[PDB]
Design a protein around this ligand. Structure first.
Ligand SMILES: *[C@@H]1O[C@H](CO)[C@@H](O)[C@H](O)[C@H]1NC(C)=O
Ligand SMILES: *[C@@H]1O[C@H](CO)[C@@H](O)[C@H](O)[C@H]1NC(C)=O
Ligand SMILES: *[C@@H]1O[C@H](CO)[C@@H](O)[C@H](O)[C@H]1NC(C)=O
Ligand SMILES: *[C@@H]1O[C@H](CO)[C@@H](O)[C@H](O)[C@H]1NC(C)=O
Lengths: 172, 325, 330, 173, 325, 173
């Protein structure tokens, strides 16, 4: 993917993470599971919704064909009308189809960026109290509690609090 | 062995795909189709107003008052007009309705007409108003009839066709749409028998319009057993305008005309049924009942329709690339 | 304390916002408004050429030479034409000026005209040039008068209106725009009185043009106290072409005509009540002068000169700076 | 923002940094200040100005409506003219409005990227001779004076020169 | 110590693209989407040659100006080429009415078949043989006429009686046909050629009416004529019948065309050559695979989209930053 | 470039890497070489080829101007036809020219990101077993085999296997 997270260093998505676009999977002695990041997910929904409504709103005018009749001495203006109506038909068909292809590419990149930014947001909390593996996953050098996990997700992870314990195991 | 937290993204059972500039057929978790390709194959009311079904009459048949179009006859309000392709009753007595396309454009639209008697037969003195009928224009009940909105004026049994004269002064709010004709006989014999002898003219005028025509006698190919023709005319008398009529003979006189009230107008040439349906977007090929922004159904419509494009599908991705495990 | 270096971005006092596909109302440090919505509600000179002000005369009143329109009588040069919506002085003697829209389009484009006498009154023999004036067409001074560019020819005290012929050969390099008419009396009486008895015609021709018309005699609703009508006509006599005029009766003859210079510049006719002033413009719209740098304009789609593209938009502001996230002062 | 720097991991802008779009805020024993990063700011200005001029050049043709009159027997061609003129007006209104919305999104992203890249550029020079505080801020594990500060800004920072000093201070805490 | 480095491709490309951000950016690979090159000639389209009208205009060809005999009978064309300087058109001065509309109808066609619609024998008791003019020479004869018309004149005795003709289409194809009305300069020429009294030309079909009578006057000399002919054209639909009636001044239809109905008419001095094209523009042939072209808006066949652009080069490769040395 | 790699923190391209767009350069006691990364290269080609074909396809309709003549009484409809034909010409010329400028910008960004992502792929695998020289180059703190180089490229690199060797070197220095 362009930011390289989606179908990238994070190979697949999570059928298990049901309540959001972007999220966390954790494993610890108490269990394992999924949790959506509500803030980035809602902000993406907000953004995507606005894009869709901007597109609808800008496309909200119509060209109007008329089916006036033209006589056998009116071939020129008859044909002028046809080329005219078909001309606007071709422009708008082009505008719609290209816009859809383009915006579809950009939207997949947005989702990719959002996932990548969340990955980096966690990474910078954890610092050296955890090992960055290949795949968007971090392996803790200390025991991470359900509160501990909750705190990583909240952006309130306490790095000094686990620094000494994690140095130990990071060396040992 | 160590505890783990991983960053990831949603996946689901979606098989719905989109195209992008970079890639085709990308399965995506959530998406929206902006294009509507479905329609109700019928005609409905628009703004809760019925369309006018011209049935077996063309537009010419209806407004000239062809005798077989009596069911249409006399007052009408419409959201749009439906003209059936095989409608057989139009100009029954052969001839040309001059400026036809421009008339069709004026009538559509057009939301209502009120039919009233513009010139009583009494208007024309010294002439016969009771005999202008033809086997070309049968009603359903009688073999020889004429348009209800015109009088084919003819010679009194005794004497010549005198100068006849008529005036109508538009006193109302509304423009009046009216018709008249000039008869062009087959023969000098038909010319002599119907109208008298000498050079005949039909002259009409208003404050802004001038008309003058004289007969052009010759035999044309037979149409409805007629080798004679009528040149038909239409015009519009504006509020406050007066119409003056004056003829020597060959006048097919305005009898009935229309108060005409005038948005987007539509004449649909279609055979679709008009049902007891209601609707917001009516297309020449059917109703669109949709929230979508594009449609591939028809460029010809009345109401609030989506935007016509040739596209088969216009699906915007909203969610993300679907990569389930 | 420990030594810090921080990576950051600019913020400022800007309250100006832009919209984007993803988000509306984004305040940004720098932006450009690309759309112009200001105009000067007046008409100005375009190429240092003043527009023609028709004033109380319509375009018909002007080129037919309606007597009340003498203020516009001489040669004229203009970069565009302004016609007042309520001008009263047009076709004073009731009638249709045929192919009027195509005449208005021809006059727009539109650089200037030279008035000159195309057919002297002497051209017509055995008929009286002097008679034809109507109460319908007063000048400001005289109650009965006629168009300056036409002669309403009438029969003399003789029983007959003779065949009359006129010729004009264009040796000039400029097209000549000229007018004529056919008179339709309400009466056989007026017809007899004004012209000879019997069948009457007006015929004219050039190398490329043929015209034939005969009077159509009937009573019409009174306009300007006239139940009679005149059919007015216009044409353009190409350089090197000759015009031949022949009439039995009922001819409103060409008297004065115009040498016509077309223009490279787009030609425009503006129907407006806006004032004309001693000012210069590069962009002139029908509802005003645009004096701008901007790419886009929402003022009008009708203009002459070089104007920004017309759009329905209220504003087209492009962000150039970044998101403006200044510190909360408290 | 999409690259996550602006209104992101760097929360706010600096009213103080007057001479550039993107730049540094530094503090040391000698003093504190703001300096724009000249090179990234000038390239963005060049790029944005090109974008604006490109849009203006592409948008520099006009459709021209015309004030022609049409008679009462010219309803069809008069309407044809009207639908034609309105048609081009609607297409162009669409092109300008859509373009501005799209380019405005992309312009904001470019700025976001330039900030993130500037931060990434400093982060890679510094290595573990500095500590990441939040908000795009690094606290040095050694004394960094003005020549040292300018050093980071210029891209010429000497990681070996300070590695020994930085290493001792890092352990001690 | 050992190195692994990540990097990108470079090459000796010096081709550049422009970007919204940047101009003159050299890139490793790119595609030009626009064609600015053309063969300056006319070629066959669908292995069908164009019709070269040579020294004749469309009027000279289709009325059969005697100097356009080259150019007589059937023609099949992919498109028409009309030389700007063609001098043989309407030799006897007058107007071909609805000229533009005739040119558009001929342009719509791909083939005509010339046939004798009204044999001279059609018109009883008038002189078919006499009607020639010094205004219409052939290369061999100083006085001739159009091949497709008969300038009928009264016989020597002589009185011009009513003459009548009919042709019933009977066919699968529309017929394009022509007629005229002679307007003599003089009362003297009128009486010499045609007899005494008011004269008419009247024609009609099931759908059409025509009536005209001479307008007698001197017009400025053109090819030595102060007289005029008014020329007319029409299309007789399959299953339609044409009635012709005149007592004077009729320039009769003689020969007509069964008409087979994009097609185009190119006014150009370019040479037709023994070559094939799939795309032909008025300024030349396009032999290209490109999407866009800046050669011409006017063409026939399958051509790329016309734009005013000098180049439309799409970067496909990346920015080219090859090492210096 | 917006992701910052191309003509950025990686200063130049490789004329030596002829078989792909993006790739690896390696030096070890066995040898040195330029080898393209096939997967990223091929996806970029598929993506770009698709963009070119989509644009060609979306652009494959023509507006068709006509040869029709207009009489001296047809100035208005003749001008109507001219403004109409010029109008569509101005619209399509705009669509093509703006689309090219826009897509060229985005195409370069896509190449820039593909390079940047390959670089981040290697940097996360190596960790502190390698040292970041500038210019997208890593110096291994351990002997790195050809087999070891293949492992970095195909993403199977064993950080534990070389960890003890690397630490001894990194700080003996
Ligand atoms: C797909 O998902 C929806 C919601 O989870 C569910 O209702 C539906 O049964 C599933 N569809 C399939 C694969 O049948
Ligand atoms: C028609 O009636 C109106 C009002 O009664 C009147 O003003 C107008 O003169 C009349 N028109 C004519 C000319 O008869
Ligand atoms: C901005 O927001 C205000 C209120 O939110 C609104 O009135 C306006 O239309 C919006 N757009 C811009 C660019 O100001
Ligand atoms: C018009 O003038 C030119 C030059 O005198 C002359 O040759 C030509 O014959 C004139 N036209 C007529 C019909 O006399």
């Amino acid at each position: 993917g362009i930011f390289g997270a989606i179908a990238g260093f994070i190979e697949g998505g999570w059928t298990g993470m049901i309540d959001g676009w972007y999220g966390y999977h954790h494993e610890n002695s108490q269990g394992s599971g999924y949790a959506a990041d509500r803030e980035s997910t809602q902000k993406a929904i907000d953004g995507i919704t606005n894009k869709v409504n901007s597109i609808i709103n800008k496309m909200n005018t119509q060209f109007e064909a008329v089916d006036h009749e033209f006589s056998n001495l009116e071939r020129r203006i008859g044909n002028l009308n046809k080329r005219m109506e078909d001309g606007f038909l071709d422009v708008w068909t082009y505008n719609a189809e290209l816009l859809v292809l383009l915006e579809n590419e950009r939207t997949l990149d947005l989702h990719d960026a959002n996932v990548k930014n969340l990955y980096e947001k966690v990474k910078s909390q954890l610092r050296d109290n955890a090992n960055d593996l290949g795949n968007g996953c971090f392996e803790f050098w200390h025991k991470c509690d359900n509160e501990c996990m909750e705190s990583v997700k909240n952006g309130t992870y306490d790095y000094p609090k686990y620094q000494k314990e994690s140095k130990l195991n990071r060396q040992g | 062995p160590g505890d783990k937290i991983c960053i990831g993204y949603h996946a689901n059972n979606s098989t719905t795909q989109v195209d992008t500039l970079l890639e085709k057929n990308v399965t995506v978790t959530h998406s929206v189709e902006l294009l509507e390709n479905q329609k109700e194959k019928r005609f409905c009311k628009i703004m809760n107003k019925a369309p006018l079904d011209l049935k077996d009459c063309t537009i010419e048949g209806w407004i000239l008052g062809n005798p077989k179009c009596d069911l249409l006859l006399g007052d009408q309000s419409w959201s749009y007009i439906v003209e059936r392709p095989n409608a057989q009753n139009g100009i029954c007595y052969p001839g040309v309705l001059n400026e036809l396309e421009e008339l069709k454009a004026f009538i559509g639209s057009g939301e209502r007409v009120e039919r009233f008697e513009m010139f009583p037969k009494s208007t024309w003195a010294g002439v016969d108003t009771s005999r202008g009928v033809t086997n070309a224009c049968p009603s359903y009940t009688i073999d020889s009839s004429f348009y209800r909105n015109l009088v084919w004026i003819v010679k009194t049994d005794s004497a010549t066709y005198p100068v006849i004269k008529g005036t109508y002064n538009n006193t109302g709010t509304q423009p009046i749409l009216y018709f008249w004709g000039v008869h062009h006989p087959l023969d000098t014999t038909v010319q002599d028998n119907l109208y008298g002898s000498g050079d005949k003219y039909v002259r009409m005028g208003t404050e802004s319009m001038n008309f003058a025509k004289s007969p052009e006698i010759a035999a044309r190919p037979a149409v409805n057993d007629q080798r004679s023709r009528i040149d038909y005319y239409w015009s519009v008398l504006r509020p406050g305008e007066t119409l003056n009529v004056e003829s020597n003979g060959n006048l097919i006189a305005p009898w009935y005309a229309y108060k005409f009230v005038s948005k987007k107008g539509a004449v649909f040439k279609s055979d679709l049924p008009i049902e007891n349906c209601d609707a917001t977007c009516q297309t020449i090929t059917g109703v669109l009942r949709t929230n979508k922004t594009f449609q591939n159904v028809s460029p010809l419509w009345i109401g609030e329709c989506p935007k016509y494009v040739k596209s088969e599908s216009l699906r915007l991705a909203t969610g993300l690339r679907n990569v389930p495990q």
